[PDB]
Every structure is written in C-alpha cells, then in structure tokens.
Design a protein around this ligand. Structure first.
Ligand code: HEC
Ligand code: HEC
Ligand code: HEC
Ligand code: HEC
Ligand SMILES: [Ca+2]
Ligand SMILES: [Ca+2]
Ligand SMILES: [Zn+2]
Ligand SMILES: [Zn+2]
Ligand SMILES: [Zn+2]
Lengths: 297, 298
C-alpha cells in the first residue's frame, strides 16, 4: 500500500543505465585524468571521488564555468539520471542552459597523447577525426553512466522486500512523502529534477531556508540518493550532519512542524538511499608528449 | 657480456615486493586514497602519487611532507619501497639520521572516528588493545605501497635473458649510461634512489645546468629512473619537461661526459626501457565519516 504510493513517486536505480566498453574505458581515463584541468591537479575523480560517494567531501569547490560561485560538489553517482543538473541560477537561463581549459585545450591535450589517440579510435571506429570535444564529452558521459548505485535498501523494498527497510525507515518514507518532501525530491534519484526559489543560509538552528532574492532565481532540489555519503549538505556545504539538514528543511517555509522522532525517521529513511557503490579500477592514464600542454604553474 | 656488466649494477623489479597481509594491504589502499587524511581534506597520497600517472602528480612541484625543504617535484610511489634514500635534498648528516600539518594525533583521530576504519584496522592487526595507532597506520600504508611495483620493464626482461627485449639503440644507451658514469649514482634495483650528491639542476637566468650545491654538506638525491618516461617534469624543481633534455643537461655536466646527439638520444632511449607494467589498482571505497571525524581545513 505504502509501496503503491511510493511507486508513484520514485523509481529504483537500474542494474545498468540505458565501442561500448572502449567508449567507457576512454571515459574512465578522461574522468580520472588531472591533466584535463588547466592546473593539471584536478580530474573529475578529484571532486567526484568514486571512493567518496562521488563527491569531494568539502564544503565547496569550483570546477565548471557555468558555476555561479563556490558550490558543494554533488555526487557523480547516478548523476546521469538527473534532468536538472545545476545548483542554481535564473530560471530562464537554467532552462536553456540544459573552468579554464577551453575545448581547444582539451582536444589538444587528448590529441597530444598516442594513448588517447588510439583510445578514441577504439571508442569511435569510423571517424576521420574521432578526437573532437563532442566525442570527448560522449566518452566521459559513457563512463558516468557506469557510476550508478543500484540495490539500495530502499530500492529493494520498493521492488517487494517488505523486510528490506525497518519500521522507522518506512515511517520516514511516509513522513517524507506526506510532509511534502517528495514534491521536489522525487524521481529515480529522489531529487535532481527541478529548481525552487529557496536556499539554505547560515545566520550570523544556525541555518534557515529563505526565499531567493528574486523568485526568478532558483536552487535545485538535489537528488538525495547516497546522501548518507555526500556530506556536507546544501549548496554552501555548511551543514555537516544529515539529521540537521533534514531538520533545517523540515522546520521551514518548505516543510511542516516535525518532531524530533519524525525528523529522526526521515533521516533514517534517507540513509536507506545508499546503493551498492561502483567498483572502479583506477585507469592507467596515457603518457604525455612534448606537444602536451604543460600545467598551469 | 653487456648483460653480465649490467647485472653487476642493477636488479630487476620482483613480481612482488618482499612484504592479515591482505587486510593490511586493503587498509593501506584506503588510507592511501583517503583525502581526509590531509588537513584540508583535499589531498590523499593518490592525489600526488597518482597510480594512473606513474605514481606522480604531473606538476612541477607540490608540498606534502613536513621533512620537505621547500616545493619539490613529487617522485613516483612506484617501486619507492625499494629506495634506501627517500628524500630529495638536505644536509648529509640530517638525511642520514632522518631515515604536512595533520599531526599523528589528528590522523589517529580521523581513522579512529570511522567505524569502517576501526574494523579495517581490526582485520589488518588481529591483536592489539588499540590496533589504531599511528605506527599501524604507517605500516598499512607501507603494505599497500609494496603493492605499487612495476615489474617486467623491457630492461628487466632483457636483463633476464631476452636478447631481443631491447633495441640496439636502447642497448647502446645502456652501455653509454654505464660507461659515462650515470650508473655510479643511478644504480640498484631502481636505477637510482640510493644516495645523495652535492649537485642540483638550476635554471639558468642548455637552459639548466648541474651545479655543485652551496656546500657539499648539502646534497640532492640521485633519484630512481624507473618509469621516468611517465614521471615528467624532471629534477627537484620539475622545470625540465622533456626527458631527452634532462638526460642532456645531466650528460653535458661534470657528472657526465661529452655525448653527442645520438649518444644522448640513446641514453634517453634506454631510459624509456625502464617503464614497467603499471599496477592495476581498484579505487577503494572509503569508510563513511562520523560526527567525531575532524572537519576539513578551509
Ligand atoms: C574543482 C572542482 C570540480 C572538478 C575538477 C570537477 N567538478 Fe563536476 N562539479 C563541481 C561542482 C562544485 C559541481 C556543482 C556546482 C554547480 O552546479 O553549481 C559539479 C557538478 C558536476 C555534475 C552535475 C552533477 C548532477 O548531480 O547533476 C557533473 C555531471 C560533473 N560535475 C561532472 C564533472 C566532470 C565530467 C568533471 C571533469 C571534466 C568534473 N565534474 C570536474 C566541481 C568539480
Ligand atoms: C519548495 C521545494 C522543496 C521542498 C518541499 C523540500 N526541499 Fe529539500 N531542498 C530544496 C532545495 C531547493 C534544496 C537545495 C538548496 C540548498 O542547498 O540551499 C534542497 C535540499 C535538500 C537537502 C540537501 C541535499 C544535499 O545533497 O546537500 C536535503 C537533505 C533536503 N532538501 C531534504 C528535504 C526534506 C527532508 C524535505 C521535507 C521535510 C524537503 N527537503 C522538502 C527544496 C525543497
Ligand atoms: C601535496 C603533495 C603530496 C601529498 C598529499 C603526498 N605526497 Fe608524498 N611526496 C610529495 C613530494 C613533493 C615528495 C618529494 C619531496 C621531498 O622528498 O623533498 C613526496 C615523496 C614521497 C615518498 C618518497 C618517494 C621516494 O621515491 O622515495 C613517499 C613514500 C611518499 N611521498 C608517500 C606519501 C604518502 C604515503 C602520502 C599520503 C599520506 C603522500 N606521500 C602524500 C608530495 C606529496
Ligand atoms: C654526481 C652524481 C650523479 C651522476 C654521475 C649522474 N646523476 Fe643524474 N642525478 C643526480 C642528482 C643529485 C639528481 C637530482 C638533482 C636534481 O633534480 O636537481 C639527478 C637526477 C637525474 C635525472 C632526473 C630524474 C627525475 O626523476 O627527475 C635524470 C634523468 C638523470 N639524473 C640522468 C642522469 C644521466 C643520464 C647521467 C649520466 C650522463 C646521470 N644522471 C649521472 C646525480 C647524478
Ligand atoms: Ca553534499
Ligand atoms: Ca617527476
Ligand atoms: Zn550561498
Ligand atoms: Zn532524536
Ligand atoms: Zn632549486
């Protein structure tokens, strides 16, 4: 019954997200290559650490031009299923929207390595110039599709394991749904679908939720899957305790009066969204050449 | 014959270094890949000793150890366990006895604060009132590091009898390397990483040169050349990016001898012969943090 209701609001993470191999292998390399960053110190992996729930464990960091400022890095895990992929911005901008190393540099970098040259060859069989920014992205994309975490306790229960979750955890599921959370944090990723004119801020609880300066400016209701592994929380990454994050959100213009037990249960439910982490072998990155652009410095 | 001579100056990398001994490696892997072991929470050993980048960070310099005398080019972790001289430079005396922020207190605390690390240390060290001690912490990391060895390089193969594992040029580079005097400092199982010398490559206001240190008391380590083809840039400053040039600035110095273009090319050709099979390493799943886990810097 509750499952019937839950089934109407969420989806489970599939065994595998919807060349292919060499396409993934190329992506893995690019994803783990720090030379793809202007400074040569950051690789996707650095901030979307596959060993840390696909995050960097820091309050904030900066790695994309679109970024509106230092933001808490979201997990790469299951990120492929997100329809809303940004933290914040003006609604119009974000709708049409969906650091330094220009596509020129990237292509050059990749271009400069024999390993990458043959790697792109395998990944894209009949192209005269398989080394193109677009393919570069597609490859990384392929790999990212690999970073999914199926079989979370929640997914198990959703599929029928009446005993996959505890009483409290189910109570948290009901309260989560009933309290209004699911209205923004839904979908296969329990979030990552839409933006809202709200953001959590620290006061000079130490944090509150306040409307954006303009209703047109919005923040993304992030995917809660694996959240137990992606601390700190909120765009600022200032709240480190999951229980408190649930709390600052429950007790706000967004949720409703919730008691300590109730809060505890929703957060208990949230821990239920941690899925089996991808086992990823660190790829052996191709050797650099004299033509390979040197790191920032 | 040349092999007989080479066999007297170097050793091949073993299939496995001479090291629970599994639960220790696994624990080491985690610590090695855990960025929370750094004060700022952004650097893990892996960050600067990237197992995908010949165990280096690919930067001119970086800073990650208290003993460091200043920004230095990060050496590969690969085969590092076989090095007897493990520092870049310093005063001979200091270095003899000697062998960033997060104090051993913090580390132990950090590890201590995670249930995963607690059970991981348990498996790694079956007996102890507190298996979670800085010493064990190091021992575990050490265990893993012993895993980061690159055997079967073309050179090792040839040393083991494969007359055809190396090319003519590469063998010429081996003879030149030996004959020119390189092997005098760059020898051992790692073709270096054994001793320090009163010389350092400095950028001239070639564009670099081997200069004697201010005082012969102060010395720089003749680093291991294995996998060097993968560990650019070169020298303590990490200012030379081309291997061929590194060979050159060193050949054309008091440490080397007069080598022409082909000779230099051959020595550098030989050096590429030291790249061994890279360790296939699965990125470990780091244990989750707790409320007691020290928060990152900032
Ligand atoms: C130095 C930090 C940093 C690096 C390096 C970095 N990222 Fe990110 N990434 C972030 C931050 C911060 C965000 C979220 C901020 C925002 O959207 O405003 C993010 C978000 C993302 C997202 C969207 C997540 C979601 O849930 O929709 C993807 C996909 C992503 N990064 C991919 C990559 C890839 C691929 C690379 C390597 C080319 C990379 N990142 C490198 C910091 C980084
Ligand atoms: C009006 C829309 C809305 C509703 C309803 C809502 N949220 Fe959110 N939630 C957001 C937005 C927007 C963010 C991100 C903004 C930020 O980080 O400041 C967010 C972020 C979060 C985060 C942080 C996730 C992370 O990865 O850091 C948690 C936890 C959360 N919400 C829990 C809940 C819970 C529990 C409820 C129900 C009591 C709820 N939310 C209801 C809009 C909503
Ligand atoms: C931010 C940079 C940085 C980080 C993080 C870092 N290292 Fe290093 N490491 C270096 C540099 C630079 C050197 C060489 C400098 C010197 O010796 O003066 C080095 C050298 C070493 C060496 C000796 C190499 C040899 O060939 O003898 C070992 C072993 C080592 N690091 C282990 C580690 C371990 C284990 C960690 C994690 C606890 C780690 N490093 C983290 C920068 C770093
Ligand atoms: C007198 C001792 C000595 C002799 C002889 C010597 N080297 Fe070195 N070599 C060093 C020292 C010390 C360093 C490191 C100092 C620095 O980086 O400035 C070094 C560094 C190097 C490096 C850089 C390694 C790296 O990882 O960055 C290369 C390459 C090198 N030597 C090649 C050679 C070659 C080729 C010869 C023979 C022509 C040779 N060396 C002879 C002392 C010596
Ligand atoms: Ca977070
Ligand atoms: Ca180097
Ligand atoms: Zn903010
Ligand atoms: Zn409570
Ligand atoms: Zn210097």
């Amino acid at each position: 019954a509750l499952r019937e209701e839950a089934k109407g609001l969420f989806e489970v993470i599939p065994m595998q997200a919807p060349v292919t191999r060499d396409k993934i292998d190329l992506g893995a390399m690019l994803f783990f290559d720090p030379r793809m960053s202007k400074s040569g110190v950051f690789s996707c992996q650095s901030c979307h650490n596959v060993g840390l729930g696909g995050v960097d464990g820091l309050e904030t960091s900066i790695g994309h031009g679109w970024q509106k400022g230092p933001r808490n890095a979201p997990t790469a895990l299951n990120a492929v299923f997100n329809v809303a992929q940004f933290w914040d911005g003006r609604a119009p901008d974000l709708a049409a929207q969906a650091m330094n190393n220009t596509p020129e540099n990237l292509v050059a970098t990749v271009q400069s390595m024999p390993g990458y040259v043959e790697a792109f060859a395998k990944a894209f069989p009949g192209q005269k110039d398989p080394i193109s920014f677009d393919n570069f992205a597609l490859a990384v994309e392929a790999f990212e599709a690999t970073l999914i975490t199926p079989n979370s306790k929640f997914d198990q229960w959703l599929m029928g394991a009446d005993g996959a979750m505890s009483a409290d955890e189910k109570a948290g599921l009901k309260l989560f749904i009933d309290t209004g959370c699911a209205a923004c944090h839904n979908g296969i990723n329990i979030g990552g679908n839409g933006y809202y004119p709200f953001g959590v801020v620290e006061k000079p609880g130490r944090f509150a939720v306040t409307a954006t300066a303009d209703d047109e400016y919005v923040f993304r209701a992030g995917p809660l899957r694996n959240i137990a592994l992606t601390a700190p929380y909120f765009h600022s990454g200032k709240v480190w305790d999951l229980r408190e994050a649930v709390s600052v959100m429950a007790n706000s213009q967004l949720g409703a009066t919730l008691d300590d037990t109730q809060v505890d249960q929703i957060t208990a439910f949230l821990g239920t969204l941690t899925g089996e982490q991808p086992e990823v072998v660190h790829p052996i990155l191709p050797v650099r050449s004299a033509q390979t652009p040197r790191p920032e410095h």
